[PDB]
Amino acid sequence: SEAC
Amino acid sequence: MKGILGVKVGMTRIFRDDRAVPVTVILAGPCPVVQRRTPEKDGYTAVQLGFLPQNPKRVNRPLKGHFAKAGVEPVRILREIRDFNPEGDTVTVEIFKPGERVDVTGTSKGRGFAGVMKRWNFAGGPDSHGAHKIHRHPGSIGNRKTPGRVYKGKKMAGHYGAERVTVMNLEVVDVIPEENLLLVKGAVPGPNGGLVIVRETKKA
Amino acid sequence: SRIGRLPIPVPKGVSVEVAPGRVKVKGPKGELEVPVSPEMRVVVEEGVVRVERPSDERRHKSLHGLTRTLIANAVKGVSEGYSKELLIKGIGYRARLVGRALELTVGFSHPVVVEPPEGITFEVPEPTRVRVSGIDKQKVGQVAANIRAIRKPSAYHEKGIYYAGEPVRLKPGK
Amino acid sequence: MIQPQTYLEVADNTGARKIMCIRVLKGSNAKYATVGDVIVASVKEAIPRGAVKEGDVVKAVVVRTKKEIKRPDGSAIRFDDNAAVIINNQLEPRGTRVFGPVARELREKGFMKIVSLAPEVL
Amino acid sequence: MKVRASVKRICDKCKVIRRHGRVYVICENPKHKQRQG
RNA sequence: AAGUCUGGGCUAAGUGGUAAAGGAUGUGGCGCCGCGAAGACAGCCAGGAGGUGGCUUAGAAGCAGCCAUCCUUUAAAGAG
RNA sequence: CGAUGUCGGCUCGUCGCAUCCUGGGGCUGAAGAAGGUCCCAAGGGUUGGGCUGUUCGCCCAUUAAAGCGGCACGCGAGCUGGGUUCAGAACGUCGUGAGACAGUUCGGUCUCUAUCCGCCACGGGCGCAGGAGGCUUGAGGGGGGCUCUUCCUAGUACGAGA
RNA sequence: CGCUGAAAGCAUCUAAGCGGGAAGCCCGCCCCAAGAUGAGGCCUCCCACGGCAGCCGGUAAGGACCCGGGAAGACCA
Ligand SMILES: [Mg+2]
Ligand SMILES: [Mg+2]
Ligand SMILES: [Mg+2]
Ligand SMILES: [Mg+2]
Ligand SMILES: [Mg+2]
Ligand SMILES: [Mg+2]
Ligand SMILES: [Mg+2]
Ligand SMILES: [Mg+2]
Ligand SMILES: [Mg+2]
Ligand SMILES: [Mg+2]
Ligand SMILES: [Mg+2]
Ligand SMILES: [Mg+2]
Ligand SMILES: [Mg+2]
Ligand SMILES: [Mg+2]
Ligand SMILES: [Mg+2]
Ligand SMILES: [Mg+2]
Ligand SMILES: [Mg+2]
Ligand SMILES: [Mg+2]
Ligand SMILES: [Mg+2]
Ligand SMILES: [Mg+2]
Ligand SMILES: [Mg+2]
Ligand SMILES: [Mg+2]
Ligand SMILES: [Mg+2]
Ligand SMILES: [Mg+2]
Ligand SMILES: [Mg+2]
Ligand SMILES: [Mg+2]
Ligand SMILES: [Mg+2]
Ligand SMILES: [Mg+2]
Ligand SMILES: [Mg+2]
Ligand SMILES: [Mg+2]
Ligand SMILES: [Mg+2]
Ligand SMILES: [Mg+2]
Ligand SMILES: [Mg+2]
Ligand SMILES: [Mg+2]
Ligand SMILES: [Mg+2]
Ligand SMILES: [Mg+2]
Ligand SMILES: [Mg+2]
Ligand SMILES: [Mg+2]
Ligand SMILES: [Mg+2]
Ligand SMILES: [Mg+2]
Ligand SMILES: [Mg+2]
Ligand SMILES: [Mg+2]
Ligand SMILES: [Mg+2]
Ligand SMILES: [Mg+2]
Ligand SMILES: [Mg+2]
Ligand SMILES: [Mg+2]
Ligand SMILES: [Mg+2]
Ligand SMILES: [Mg+2]
Ligand SMILES: [Mg+2]
Ligand SMILES: [Mg+2]
Ligand SMILES: [Mg+2]
Ligand SMILES: [Mg+2]
Ligand SMILES: [Mg+2]
Ligand SMILES: [Mg+2]
Ligand SMILES: [Mg+2]
Ligand SMILES: [Mg+2]
Ligand SMILES: [Mg+2]
Ligand SMILES: [Mg+2]
Ligand SMILES: [Mg+2]
Ligand SMILES: [Mg+2]
Ligand SMILES: [Mg+2]
Ligand SMILES: [Mg+2]
Ligand SMILES: [Mg+2]
Ligand SMILES: [Mg+2]
Ligand SMILES: [Mg+2]
Ligand SMILES: [Mg+2]
Ligand SMILES: [Mg+2]
Ligand SMILES: [Mg+2]
Ligand SMILES: [Mg+2]
Ligand SMILES: [Mg+2]
Ligand SMILES: [Mg+2]
Ligand SMILES: [Mg+2]
Ligand SMILES: [Mg+2]
Ligand SMILES: [Mg+2]
Ligand SMILES: [Mg+2]
Ligand SMILES: [Mg+2]
Ligand SMILES: [Mg+2]
Ligand SMILES: [Mg+2]
Ligand SMILES: [Mg+2]
Ligand SMILES: [Mg+2]
Ligand SMILES: [Mg+2]
Ligand SMILES: [Mg+2]
Ligand SMILES: [Mg+2]
Ligand SMILES: [Mg+2]
Ligand SMILES: [Mg+2]
Ligand SMILES: [Mg+2]
Ligand SMILES: [Mg+2]
Ligand SMILES: [Mg+2]
Ligand SMILES: [Mg+2]
Ligand SMILES: [Mg+2]
Ligand SMILES: [Mg+2]
Ligand SMILES: [Mg+2]
Ligand SMILES: [Mg+2]
Ligand SMILES: [Mg+2]
Ligand SMILES: [Mg+2]
Ligand SMILES: [Mg+2]
Ligand SMILES: [Mg+2]
Ligand SMILES: [Mg+2]
Ligand SMILES: [Mg+2]
Ligand SMILES: [Mg+2]
Ligand SMILES: [Mg+2]
Ligand SMILES: [Mg+2]
Ligand SMILES: [Mg+2]
Ligand SMILES: [Mg+2]
Ligand SMILES: [Mg+2]
Ligand SMILES: [Mg+2]
Ligand SMILES: [Mg+2]
Ligand SMILES: [Mg+2]
Ligand SMILES: [Mg+2]
Ligand SMILES: [Mg+2]
Ligand SMILES: [Mg+2]
Ligand SMILES: [Mg+2]
Ligand SMILES: [Mg+2]
Ligand SMILES: [Mg+2]
Ligand SMILES: [Mg+2]
Ligand SMILES: [Mg+2]
Ligand SMILES: [Mg+2]
Ligand SMILES: [Mg+2]
Ligand SMILES: [Mg+2]
Ligand SMILES: [Mg+2]
Ligand SMILES: [Mg+2]
Ligand SMILES: [Mg+2]
Ligand SMILES: [Mg+2]
Ligand SMILES: [Mg+2]
Ligand SMILES: [Mg+2]
Ligand SMILES: [Mg+2]
Ligand SMILES: [Mg+2]
Ligand SMILES: [Mg+2]
Ligand SMILES: [Mg+2]
Ligand SMILES: [Mg+2]
Ligand SMILES: [Zn+2]
């Protein structure tokens, strides 16, 4: 995940 | 409704009115009748047919008793043709005339364990542009938490061919009574030497 | 104001018998049979048939009127008979009999051959008039309706199959 | 076996020298055109002052194919190029001459004028 | 046939009937044929 | 688990067993006018006329725009 | 929040019907042909390409038609990684400055092994009151379900003509 | 869309009854299928063997094991  | 047990021989093309006609040659008869299914006894109408003589020293006692009630030689194969009560006790290629349409049932060629591309004509994945070891893979098999499962009858990999296949409405090109030969325009299921069942057509 | 209390005149010599939920009408041209509600009462008098309803509830009043006309239509059918006439119209439209069957020439690429059911007799006086004849009133009307349907009156022109007595109403075109 | 992107030589004196098929006018989604089929195409090369110029979207009928077409007598025929003749919406040739042999299939498909202008029907 | 929730008479030859559980308006004028729904 | 329990009534939509404005000869029960044997309502048998139509417009003369829709022989007839 | 991976695409389907086409209809300000509007209908079908990461949208050439939505904006333990979304760099802008910007620009580590459910296939076991070798009935399931062009009828019906 | 037809003297495809009517629904076509435990049916073969619905050994019609292979197949079948 790179939930930005 | 009428039928006969055959052997697939091979393919060729003959010439009829300056046209090339691909054919499959079938060694149909002769099929002696071994037993008759009646509505009084069994509940339906059919003929049990014999095909190919067999080494009498190869057919056990239960089967020999069966052949004796009909007074016939040992035959290699026994198959029923439903809704057919022929007059005689023997069925030969001459129940068909050239110009009639027939259906033929054989056992297709067996591909063993077949991938989804050969089994179901799937499209695979790309062969470049980053594709990462999915070149022949089925893709996605579902959705997410709803329904959270995989449909029955989902197209996947697995065994293929060596299954009963009927092709329907083939034109009988010629009949050669002297050799028990039956000619049929087009392609018939299975390999040369495979057993096939030839029936009068059902398409009107 | 009441159909079902109107007595039914019966001509000489027509037979009328009463049965459970049935009555049978035997006359000069044959015999019909009218199925009646058990809730009604068919009573035979001197050359007269009457129908009596048990209460004044709406189902009894509705079967009452219905039932009287059913008996009367059958008794007229076995004596006098029923018929319906059709006028064909058009520049190329005509018809003829072929045996007992009815062949129509009415503008298709083919003719249309109508066969008469049991109890129905066809007849073509002139190539443009057709008559349906039988004892059963409802059946004579169904046969006539079917024949008409094959080529209905045109909305804009006076061609098609018309009931005798049917008005010719048309609308313009430009 | 002509499909979109396929280049075709021009077997006539219309002025066009090469055309690029853009559509197979045979149904909703024919994959391939053969002999006797009509395509839509773009003129990619012309000779000057011809009846057609570069950048024209025209009609044409395929008269020769490198993929060999088969026949009911069991024979087949195969040409060295892929060639077509430019037509108008009445299937008639828009030029006055037809260069090279054409297939006999064009006759059945109703392109009789091209066939007669052809120097050899094979 | 018009299909709507407000089926009404349109002219004095319009007739409001009920057959097979549905309300209809039938009439000599074919534009006036109505069914509720 | 314990009533196919007792009596009066309603519903025909499986309504009951998920919704509104609004629409309806669904059905049952009330109320209030009108008209009627001074023969009504329906149907039918009838008569259904005329001066004759005027701005209108090559005519709209019952049956294109208008103008008021005037009289009448009459049991009644609309210059529709 | 001791982690429910986030756009689009590809692959693979499946469902709804407020139906884009094909089938059946009523009305028409429906002559014919061709349309408009509404009703029934979810069986099948619903193309290839240019541009942009795009969804969407416009455009080219077709078509019977080029439907609209749902399934974690269906589907990254199935793939991609163009976008978005760290660390480098730069432009416009803002800040004295350090730095900042759903503003732009170029680049940027996406994890061999499936335990249980589910799915595709294939066997082993026992059962079907004696034990066997054959041949079968079909409860119940699954597959399939599209559609166009030309000709004849007939240049007739219809229409001044087209 | 009808035929016949009241309630409602007329009218009404409906309340009693009867028609016509979709690429859709049922069957019909192709394939799987009696673990269909509701485990079906027909033809044919063996049979009452020896020791205290059970028991353990020798047999029956038959089957398996092994081996030569197979357009059958991952092994198995
Ligand atoms: Mg060979
Ligand atoms: Mg020959
Ligand atoms: Mg076989
Ligand atoms: Mg095989
Ligand atoms: Mg093969
Ligand atoms: Mg294999
Ligand atoms: Mg594969
Ligand atoms: Mg395949
Ligand atoms: Mg395959
Ligand atoms: Mg393949
Ligand atoms: Mg691909
Ligand atoms: Mg692809
Ligand atoms: Mg590939
Ligand atoms: Mg590769
Ligand atoms: Mg990678
Ligand atoms: Mg990788
Ligand atoms: Mg991988
Ligand atoms: Mg690779
Ligand atoms: Mg998940
Ligand atoms: Mg996901
Ligand atoms: Mg679930
Ligand atoms: Mg297999
Ligand atoms: Mg198959
Ligand atoms: Mg054929
Ligand atoms: Mg075979
Ligand atoms: Mg064999
Ligand atoms: Mg009819
Ligand atoms: Mg040249
Ligand atoms: Mg040349
Ligand atoms: Mg030029
Ligand atoms: Mg240029
Ligand atoms: Mg240029
Ligand atoms: Mg040309
Ligand atoms: Mg020549
Ligand atoms: Mg309104
Ligand atoms: Mg009416
Ligand atoms: Mg009780
Ligand atoms: Mg209801
Ligand atoms: Mg309910
Ligand atoms: Mg309900
Ligand atoms: Mg969280
Ligand atoms: Mg944890
Ligand atoms: Mg956790
Ligand atoms: Mg996460
Ligand atoms: Mg975690
Ligand atoms: Mg986790
Ligand atoms: Mg791709
Ligand atoms: Mg979908
Ligand atoms: Mg709908
Ligand atoms: Mg239609
Ligand atoms: Mg349609
Ligand atoms: Mg017109
Ligand atoms: Mg039309
Ligand atoms: Mg319409
Ligand atoms: Mg409608
Ligand atoms: Mg559909
Ligand atoms: Mg769809
Ligand atoms: Mg390019
Ligand atoms: Mg693109
Ligand atoms: Mg785009
Ligand atoms: Mg989106
Ligand atoms: Mg956009
Ligand atoms: Mg169209
Ligand atoms: Mg279009
Ligand atoms: Mg597209
Ligand atoms: Mg969607
Ligand atoms: Mg969609
Ligand atoms: Mg949702
Ligand atoms: Mg959303
Ligand atoms: Mg969102
Ligand atoms: Mg997604
Ligand atoms: Mg996803
Ligand atoms: Mg990933
Ligand atoms: Mg993704
Ligand atoms: Mg996932
Ligand atoms: Mg995952
Ligand atoms: Mg996964
Ligand atoms: Mg997961
Ligand atoms: Mg995958
Ligand atoms: Mg990137
Ligand atoms: Mg961007
Ligand atoms: Mg600056
Ligand atoms: Mg500051
Ligand atoms: Mg400042
Ligand atoms: Mg500054
Ligand atoms: Mg930034
Ligand atoms: Mg941003
Ligand atoms: Mg930001
Ligand atoms: Mg911006
Ligand atoms: Mg940027
Ligand atoms: Mg920049
Ligand atoms: Mg960037
Ligand atoms: Mg680089
Ligand atoms: Mg990258
Ligand atoms: Mg790895
Ligand atoms: Mg596992
Ligand atoms: Mg894996
Ligand atoms: Mg589990
Ligand atoms: Mg498992
Ligand atoms: Mg097993
Ligand atoms: Mg058993
Ligand atoms: Mg047994
Ligand atoms: Mg057995
Ligand atoms: Mg049985
Ligand atoms: Mg069977
Ligand atoms: Mg079944
Ligand atoms: Mg089951
Ligand atoms: Mg279909
Ligand atoms: Mg003609
Ligand atoms: Mg004609
Ligand atoms: Mg009527
Ligand atoms: Mg009637
Ligand atoms: Mg009446
Ligand atoms: Mg009824
Ligand atoms: Mg019916
Ligand atoms: Mg029917
Ligand atoms: Mg069809
Ligand atoms: Mg079977
Ligand atoms: Mg069994
Ligand atoms: Mg079986
Ligand atoms: Mg049991
Ligand atoms: Mg049991
Ligand atoms: Mg049992
Ligand atoms: Mg059960
Ligand atoms: Mg058994
Ligand atoms: Mg093996
Ligand atoms: Mg082996
Ligand atoms: Mg092994
Ligand atoms: Mg092996
Ligand atoms: Mg072994
Ligand atoms: Zn009206």
What share of the residues of chain E lie within helices?
under 10%
Number of helices of chain C: 2
Q: So how many helices of chain E?
A: 0
**CA-to-CA gap between the ends of chain E?**
12 Å
Helix content of chain C: 10-25%
Strand fraction of chain E: 35-45%
InterPro entries (chain D): Ribosomal_uL14 (IPR000218), Ribosomal_uL14_bac-type (IPR005745), Ribosomal_uL14_CS (IPR019972), Ribosomal_uL14_sf (IPR036853)
Protein name (chain D): Large ribosomal subunit protein uL14
Subunit structure (chain D): Part of the 50S ribosomal subunit. Contacts protein L19. Forms a bridge to the 30S subunit in the 70S ribosome, contacting the 16S rRNA.
Organism (chain D): Thermus thermophilus (strain ATCC 27634 / DSM 579 / HB8)
Description:
- Chain D: This is Large ribosomal subunit protein uL14.
- Chain D: One of its GO terms (biological process) is translation.
- Chain D: GO terms for molecular function: large ribosomal subunit rRNA binding; structural constituent of ribosome.
- This is part of a larger assembly, with chains A (4 residues), B (204 residues), C (174 residues), D (122 residues) and E (37 residues).
- In chain A, 0% of the residues lie in helices and 0% in strands.
- Chain A has no helix or strand.
- With 4 residues, chain A is largely without helices or strands.
- In chain D, β1 (7-10) and β2 form a beta hairpin.
- By secondary structure, chain E is mainly beta.
- Chain E contains no helices and 4 strands.
- Classes of the chains: A little secondary structure (4), B mainly beta (204), C alpha+beta (174), D mainly beta (122), E mainly beta (37).
- The complex binds magnesium ion (130 copies) and zinc ion.
- One magnesium ion (MG) binds at residues 127, 135 of chain B.
- Residues 147-149 of chain B line the site of one magnesium ion.
- Chain B binds 3 RNA strands through β3, α1, β5, β8 and β9.
